[PDB]
Amino acid sequence: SALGKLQDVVNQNAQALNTLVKQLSSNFGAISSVLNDILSRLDPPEAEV
């Protein structure tokens, strides 16, 4: 644990990136979190919401 100062920076960057990636799985109120799934189910006027 001597290099904890550098390990903290590495861990923080990796964890921020992982959280950014995991945010892609959220619905945010939509019917699905998959763009292809949304586009392959709804027509052009309803998929927009």
């Binding site: 019917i31 392959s40 189910r41 709804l42 027509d43 309803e46």
Partner: protein, 49 residues
């Protein structure tokens, strides 16, 4: 109620049939229905006001 499964569904004829006064899809679009795969489909029949 009826569990409709193990079959190929052609919703195009159902959509084209003009006998229906009401035809609303609340999670998909009738045009896109023929391009989707479902695990199981339910059919509920009754006569209402």
């Amino acid at each position: 109620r009826k569990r409709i499964s193990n079959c190929v569904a052609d919703y195009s004829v159902l959509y084209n049939s003009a006998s229906f006064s009401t035809f609303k899809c609340y999670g998909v679009s009738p045009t896109k229905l023929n391009d989707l795969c479902f695990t199981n489909v339910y059919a509920d029949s009754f006569v209402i006001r």
